[PDB]
């Protein structure tokens, strides 16, 4: 005998350049064997998401596995999770096809804007030793510029803080500088730079009645940055 994929399932980052797909030969190794593979489309398109590939996996006498590089294509357009597969045909004569003989590889986008939130909800700190950066994390993922307001609230102890953080591309983290009592500090809602080419196209899609949005457009709409659970932090001062 038998010949079958293993791993029979690979998960892969759109930016992984490529990755190995491994195949196994059980049963009578002793003699050369072989088998073919062909990438074939799922939701992930050969052409846009990966490259098509038929091939011949040769198994000289004494080898019960072959790997083989598949290329995952990278781009800057937000897409949901996508799929594509790889099938074993044409085994050599000695041998039967097993389970699985269809490998599944999924492409994870990384063109989201994306989702913004604090790390924890409470941070204990020190009567007066100055400053001390309050982190803000950007979750999966880190495409486009995203601007995002910040202001503080009272609960004399600190100086009030306001602004708009600017996460440029692949900016995943940024910091608010401040500057037993507590106060809260909020984050508003993320928006793109008003004038980043994307913010427009989306504005365009954002008028086509939803019933009109091309599938492409519907997925362009949820490319937009969002907020997470905790959009507020308390600061305890002791
Ligand atoms: Ca695609
Ligand atoms: Ca993709
Ligand atoms: Ca993409
Ligand atoms: Ca990408």
UniProtKB/Swiss-Prot annotation:
GO BP term, example: sodium ion transmembrane transport
Tissue specificity statement from the Swiss-Prot or TrEMBL entry: Ubiquitously expressed with higher expression in head compared to body (at protein level). Enriched in photoreceptor cells of the eye (at protein level). In the adult head, expressed in retina, optic ganglia and all neuronal tissues.
Residues engaged in binding Ca(2+) 1: 14, 49, 79, 82
GO MF annotation: an example: calcium ion binding
Annotated binding of Ca(2+) 3, by residue: 14, 74-75, 110-111
Coiled-coil positions: none
Transmembrane in keyword set: yes
Sites where the protein binds Ca(2+) 4: 14, 75, 77, 79, 109, 111
Record has rRNA processing as a keyword: no
Function according to Swiss-Prot or TrEMBL: Na(+)/Ca(2+) antiporter that couples the energy of a Na(+) electrochemical gradient to the movement of Ca(2+) against an electrochemical gradient across a membrane, which contributes to the regulation of cytoplasmic Ca(2+) levels. Mediates Na(+)/Ca(2+) exchange in photoreceptor cells and involved in controlling Ca(2+) levels during phototransduction, affecting magnitude of the photoresponse, activation kinetics, signal amplification, response termination, and light adaptation.
Name of the featured protein: Sodium/calcium exchanger Calx
Residues of the full protein shown: 442 to 693 of 950
């Amino acid at each position: 005998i038998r010949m079958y994929f293993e791993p029979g399932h690979y998960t892969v980052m759109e930016n992984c350049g490529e990755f190995e797909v491994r195949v196994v030969r059980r049963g009578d190794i002793s003699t050369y064997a072989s088998v073919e593979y062909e990438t074939q489309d799922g939701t992930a398109s050969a052409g846009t998401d990966f490259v098509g590939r038929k091939g011949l996996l040769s198994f000289p006498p004494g080898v019960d596995e072959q790997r083989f590089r598949i290329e995952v294509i990278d781009d800057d357009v937000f897409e949901e999770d996508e799929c594509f597969y790889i099938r074993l045909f044409n085994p050599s004569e000695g041998v039967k096809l097993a389970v699985p003989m269809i490998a599944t590889v999924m492409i994870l986008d990384d063109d989201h804007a994306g989702i913004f939130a604090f790390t924890d909800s409470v941070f204990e700190i020190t009567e007066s030793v100055g400053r001390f950066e309050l982190k803000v994390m950007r979750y999966s993922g880190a495409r486009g510029t995203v601007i995002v307001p910040y202001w503080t609230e009272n609960d004399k102890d600190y100086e009030g803080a306001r602004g708009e953080l600017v996460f440029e591309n692949n900016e995943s983290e940024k910091f608010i500088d401040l500057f037993d009592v507590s106060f809260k500090v909020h984050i508003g809602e993320p928006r793109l730079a008003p004038d980043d080419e994307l913010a427009a196209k989306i504005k365009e899609v954002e008028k086509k009645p939803v019933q009109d949005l091309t599938e492409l457009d519907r997925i362009l709409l949820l490319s937009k940055p969002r907020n997470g659970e905790l959009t507020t932090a308390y600061v305890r001062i002791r």
